Amino acid sequence: RELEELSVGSDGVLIWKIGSYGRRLQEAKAKPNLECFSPAFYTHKYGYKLQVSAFLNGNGSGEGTHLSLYIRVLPGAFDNLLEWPFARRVTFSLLDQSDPGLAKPQHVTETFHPDPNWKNFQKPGTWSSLGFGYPKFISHQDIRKRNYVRDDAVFIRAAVELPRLEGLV
């Protein structure tokens, strides 16, 4: 799995394929506990370590009804060089897998300013490893409504909005 990470981490954009959706959703019905873990990924070179988890069958207020998406800060080798708490804006997306030439795909996208007072968005070392995000990201009804599920697979995107710092032209 160190290669899945090497292939992701660098520029704050994870794209995560979750395969065997139908099976995985059936097990999440049998174990409500069951969560999928993305590869860890870094917001920039020597940046924050982040991970994404998905509950195909929902968690908290969306248990049973929704796909639930969370993002989390992990202990990073470079934590002692970064500002805390984590405060970059995160943008979750579930990708509609329709050809973008043949039809501008309708993606489900949400953006949130992290909660400064969440035990996890502060520097690892302070006293939870839980996560933050959307328990009602998309409905079991709506997830089937387009190409969000194509080829028994789903695509979750997490983008750390870090804009370009340039001088005036």
Partner: peptide, 10 residues
């Protein structure tokens, strides 16, 4: 069922 959920926004 039950859950130790992680925090959220609407």
């Amino acid at each position: 069922l039950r859950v130790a959920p992680q925090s959220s926004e609407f």
